[PDB]
Protein backbone atom coordinates (compact mmCIF):
# COMPACT_ATOMS: atom_id res chain seq x y z
CA UNK A 1 0.00 0.00 0.00
CA UNK A 2 2.82 2.51 0.48
CA UNK A 3 3.75 3.68 -2.71
CA UNK A 4 7.39 2.30 -3.88
CA UNK A 5 9.93 3.42 -6.34
CA UNK A 6 9.66 1.84 -9.39
CA UNK A 7 5.64 2.65 -9.41
CA UNK A 8 6.08 6.50 -9.02
CA UNK A 9 7.87 7.75 -12.59
CA UNK A 10 9.74 10.96 -12.13
CA UNK A 11 7.28 13.98 -12.41
CA UNK A 12 4.63 12.28 -10.71
CA UNK A 13 3.25 12.27 -6.77
CA UNK A 14 1.79 10.36 -4.58
CA UNK A 15 -0.20 11.03 -1.34
CA UNK A 16 -0.22 8.50 1.74
CA UNK A 17 -2.50 8.87 4.33
CA UNK A 18 -0.96 9.05 7.99
CA UNK A 19 -3.49 9.67 10.44
CA UNK A 20 -6.38 12.27 10.25
CA UNK A 21 -5.04 15.32 8.77
CA UNK A 22 -1.64 14.25 7.98
CA UNK A 23 -0.15 12.62 4.85
CA UNK A 24 3.08 11.68 3.49
CA UNK A 25 4.29 13.18 -0.16
CA UNK A 26 6.48 10.57 -2.36
CA UNK A 27 8.34 11.72 -5.42
CA UNK A 28 11.39 10.34 -7.17
CA UNK A 29 14.32 12.05 -8.70
CA UNK A 30 17.02 10.90 -10.24
CA UNK A 31 20.62 11.22 -8.25
CA UNK A 32 24.03 10.33 -9.93
CA UNK A 33 22.85 7.97 -12.67
CA UNK A 34 19.56 6.39 -10.41
CA UNK A 35 16.41 7.47 -9.24
CA UNK A 36 15.38 7.27 -5.44
CA UNK A 37 12.11 8.05 -3.51
CA UNK A 38 11.67 10.80 -1.58
CA UNK A 39 9.67 11.50 1.04
CA UNK A 40 7.78 14.46 2.89
CA UNK A 41 5.10 15.43 5.32
CA UNK A 42 2.04 17.45 5.06
CA UNK A 43 -0.08 18.62 7.94
CA UNK A 44 -3.66 20.23 8.80
CA UNK A 45 -3.12 23.42 10.02
CA UNK A 46 -7.01 24.61 10.69
CA UNK A 47 -8.20 25.60 6.88
CA UNK A 48 -4.18 25.95 5.94
CA UNK A 49 -1.78 23.37 4.95
CA UNK A 50 2.09 22.78 6.38
CA UNK A 51 4.10 21.24 3.89
CA UNK A 52 7.13 19.68 5.57
CA UNK A 53 9.67 19.85 2.63
CA UNK A 54 9.46 20.52 -1.51
CA UNK A 55 9.22 17.36 -3.59
CA UNK A 56 12.60 17.58 -4.73
CA UNK A 57 12.86 19.60 -7.35
CA UNK A 58 10.80 22.29 -8.92
CA UNK A 59 8.51 19.69 -11.73
CA UNK A 60 7.44 17.58 -8.46
CA UNK A 61 6.83 20.22 -6.09
CA UNK A 62 4.49 21.67 -8.67
CA UNK A 63 3.05 17.77 -9.45
CA UNK A 64 3.08 18.22 -5.04
CA UNK A 65 1.13 21.21 -5.76
CA UNK A 66 -1.61 20.32 -7.92
CA UNK A 67 -2.44 16.91 -6.11
CA UNK A 68 -2.80 18.26 -2.94
CA UNK A 69 -5.75 21.41 -4.80
CA UNK A 70 -7.35 17.92 -6.19
CA UNK A 71 -6.85 15.41 -3.38
CA UNK A 72 -7.12 17.50 -0.08
CA UNK A 73 -8.34 21.25 -1.77
CA UNK A 74 -7.04 23.18 1.61
CA UNK A 75 -4.77 25.83 0.68
CA UNK A 76 -0.57 25.28 1.47
CA UNK A 77 0.40 28.38 3.70
CA UNK A 78 3.29 27.69 5.09
CA UNK A 79 6.27 24.98 4.48
CA UNK A 80 9.64 23.94 5.86
CA UNK A 81 12.65 22.38 4.86
CA UNK A 82 14.43 20.05 7.25
CA UNK A 83 17.87 20.08 5.83
CA UNK A 84 19.52 22.49 3.13
CA UNK A 85 20.06 20.05 -0.15
CA UNK A 86 18.24 19.76 -3.04
CA UNK A 87 15.27 16.97 -2.10
CA UNK A 88 14.63 19.57 0.54
CA UNK A 89 14.55 23.27 -0.75
CA UNK A 90 14.69 22.29 -4.34
CA UNK A 91 10.83 23.72 -5.34
CA UNK A 92 11.07 26.50 -3.14
CA UNK A 93 10.51 29.01 -6.39
CA UNK A 94 7.71 27.08 -7.15
CA UNK A 95 6.19 27.47 -3.80
CA UNK A 96 7.09 30.83 -2.85
CA UNK A 97 5.59 31.66 -6.76
CA UNK A 98 2.35 29.89 -5.26
CA UNK A 99 2.25 31.84 -2.30
CA UNK A 100 3.30 29.39 -0.13
CA UNK A 101 5.49 31.21 3.36
CA UNK A 102 8.42 29.38 3.01
CA UNK A 103 10.98 28.90 6.46
CA UNK A 104 14.03 26.97 7.21
CA UNK A 105 16.56 27.50 10.17
CA UNK A 106 19.06 30.63 9.60
CA UNK A 107 22.18 27.72 9.36
CA UNK A 108 19.95 26.00 6.29
CA UNK A 109 19.12 29.22 4.87
CA UNK A 110 23.03 29.89 5.10
CA UNK A 111 23.86 26.62 3.62
CA UNK A 112 21.56 26.57 0.93
CA UNK A 113 23.07 30.00 -0.58
CA UNK A 114 26.52 28.74 -0.46
CA UNK A 115 25.59 25.70 -2.06
CA UNK A 116 23.47 27.18 -4.93
CA UNK A 117 20.28 25.82 -4.20
CA UNK A 118 16.90 27.66 -3.40
CA UNK A 119 16.70 29.58 -0.37
CA UNK A 120 13.16 29.42 2.13
CA UNK A 121 12.47 33.18 2.36
CA UNK A 122 11.44 33.21 6.42
CA UNK A 123 14.15 31.81 9.00
CA UNK A 124 13.03 29.93 11.88
CA UNK A 125 14.31 31.13 15.13
CA UNK A 126 14.85 29.16 18.11
CA UNK A 127 16.85 26.20 16.38
CA UNK A 128 20.43 26.80 17.08
CA UNK A 129 21.49 24.35 19.68
CA UNK A 130 21.19 20.16 19.61
CA UNK A 131 18.52 19.29 22.05
CA UNK A 132 16.40 22.99 20.95
CA UNK A 133 12.56 22.74 19.85
CA UNK A 134 9.75 25.59 18.62
CA UNK A 135 6.34 25.09 18.02
CA UNK A 136 5.14 25.61 14.18
CA UNK A 137 1.73 25.37 14.44
CA UNK A 138 0.30 22.07 14.63
CA UNK A 139 4.28 20.60 14.77
CA UNK A 140 6.95 20.76 17.52
CA UNK A 141 9.90 21.50 15.28
CA UNK A 142 13.64 19.60 16.67
CA UNK A 143 17.26 20.23 16.07
CA UNK A 144 18.62 17.22 17.01
CA UNK A 145 22.08 18.04 16.24
CA UNK A 146 24.47 17.12 13.33
CA UNK A 147 23.68 13.90 11.81
CA UNK A 148 22.67 13.64 7.95
CA UNK A 149 23.82 17.02 7.77
CA UNK A 150 24.64 19.97 10.42
CA UNK A 151 21.40 21.41 10.41
CA UNK A 152 18.86 18.51 9.97
CA UNK A 153 16.09 18.91 11.21
CA UNK A 154 13.12 16.62 12.35
CA UNK A 155 9.22 17.08 12.61
CA UNK A 156 6.70 16.18 15.49
CA UNK A 157 2.95 15.75 15.15
CA UNK A 158 2.03 15.60 18.47
CA UNK A 159 -2.15 15.20 17.72
CA UNK A 160 -0.82 11.87 16.02
CA UNK A 161 2.23 10.97 17.39
CA UNK A 162 3.82 10.80 14.22
CA UNK A 163 7.92 11.35 14.13
CA UNK A 164 9.58 13.00 10.64
CA UNK A 165 12.99 12.41 10.46
CA UNK A 166 14.02 12.97 7.05
CA UNK A 167 17.72 11.97 5.85
CA UNK A 168 18.66 11.65 9.22
CA UNK A 169 16.55 8.39 9.86
CA UNK A 170 16.88 5.55 7.62
CA UNK A 171 14.07 3.01 6.49
CA UNK A 172 14.36 -0.48 8.09
CA UNK A 173 15.35 -2.31 4.45
CA UNK A 174 17.87 0.31 3.90
CA UNK A 175 21.69 -1.62 4.59
CA UNK A 176 24.17 1.09 3.11
CA UNK A 177 24.53 4.85 4.10
CA UNK A 178 23.75 6.76 1.10
CA UNK A 179 24.81 10.45 0.27
CA UNK A 180 27.19 10.97 3.60
CA UNK A 181 29.29 13.99 1.83
CA UNK A 182 28.15 16.44 4.59
CA UNK A 183 27.14 14.14 6.98
CA UNK A 184 28.79 14.16 10.91
CA UNK A 185 28.98 10.35 11.13
CA UNK A 186 30.80 10.58 15.07
CA UNK A 187 27.97 12.95 15.59
CA UNK A 188 24.90 10.91 13.93
CA UNK A 189 24.66 7.99 16.44
CA UNK A 190 23.97 10.67 19.17
CA UNK A 191 21.66 12.87 17.89
CA UNK A 192 19.43 10.07 17.26
CA UNK A 193 19.87 9.48 20.63
CA UNK A 194 18.39 12.95 21.79
CA UNK A 195 15.45 12.12 19.59
CA UNK A 196 14.69 8.71 20.99
CA UNK A 197 14.65 10.95 24.56
CA UNK A 198 12.50 13.38 23.07
CA UNK A 199 9.83 11.96 21.47
CA UNK A 200 9.08 8.27 23.33
CA UNK A 201 6.21 7.82 22.63
CA UNK A 202 6.01 8.10 18.55
CA UNK A 203 3.68 5.53 16.89
CA UNK A 204 5.01 6.46 12.94
CA UNK A 205 8.33 7.20 12.06
CA UNK A 206 8.76 8.20 8.53
CA UNK A 207 12.55 8.44 7.00
CA UNK A 208 13.52 10.60 4.42
CA UNK A 209 13.00 7.79 1.82
CA UNK A 210 10.94 4.98 1.84
CA UNK A 211 8.69 2.74 4.15
CA UNK A 212 7.48 4.09 7.19
CA UNK A 213 8.05 2.21 10.83
CA UNK A 214 8.04 2.45 13.76
CA UNK A 215 10.74 3.78 16.70
CA UNK A 216 13.04 0.92 15.36
CA UNK A 217 13.52 2.75 12.64
CA UNK A 218 16.47 5.36 14.71
CA UNK A 219 18.26 1.90 16.31
CA UNK A 220 18.16 0.47 13.08
CA UNK A 221 19.94 3.71 11.26
CA UNK A 222 22.54 4.01 14.23
CA UNK A 223 23.76 0.67 13.32
CA UNK A 224 24.00 1.53 9.67
CA UNK A 225 26.16 4.57 10.59
CA UNK A 226 28.33 2.72 13.08
CA UNK A 227 28.96 -0.21 10.22
CA UNK A 228 29.93 2.66 8.04
CA UNK A 229 32.25 4.09 10.37
CA UNK A 230 33.86 1.08 10.79
C1 LIG B 1 20.41 10.42 1.58
C2 LIG B 1 19.67 11.73 1.33
O1 LIG B 1 18.55 11.87 1.75
S1 LIG B 1 20.55 13.05 0.51
C3 LIG B 1 19.74 14.17 -0.55
C4 LIG B 1 20.26 13.69 -1.87
C5 LIG B 1 19.40 12.52 -2.31
C6 LIG B 1 20.04 11.17 -2.03
C7 LIG B 1 18.97 10.10 -2.07
C8 LIG B 1 19.56 8.72 -1.83
C9 LIG B 1 18.86 7.82 -1.04
C10 LIG B 1 19.37 6.56 -0.79
C11 LIG B 1 20.59 6.20 -1.32
C12 LIG B 1 21.29 7.09 -2.10
C13 LIG B 1 20.79 8.36 -2.36
P1 LIG B 1 20.28 15.12 -3.00
O2 LIG B 1 19.35 16.20 -2.67
O3 LIG B 1 21.62 15.77 -3.10
O4 LIG B 1 19.91 14.80 -4.37
CL1 LIG C 1 22.08 19.63 -2.84
ZN1 LIG D 1 20.73 15.66 2.31
Same mark, same amino acid.
Given at each position: ???????? %?????????????????? /?????????????? +?? !? @??????? +???????? =?????????? #? =?????????????????? @????????? /? *?? !???????????? /? #??????? %????? #?????????? @??? %?????????????????????????????? *?????? @??? *???????? +? *??????? #?????????????????????????? =????? !???????
Amino acid at each position: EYPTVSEI %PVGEVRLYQIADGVWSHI /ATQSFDGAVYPSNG +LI !V @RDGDELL +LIDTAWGA =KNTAALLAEI #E =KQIGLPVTRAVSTHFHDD @RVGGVDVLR /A *AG !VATYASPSTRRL /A #EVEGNEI %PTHSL #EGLSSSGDAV @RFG %PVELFYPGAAHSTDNLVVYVPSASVLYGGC *AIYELS @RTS *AGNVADAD +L *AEWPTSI #ERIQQHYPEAQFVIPGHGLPGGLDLL =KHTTN !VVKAHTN
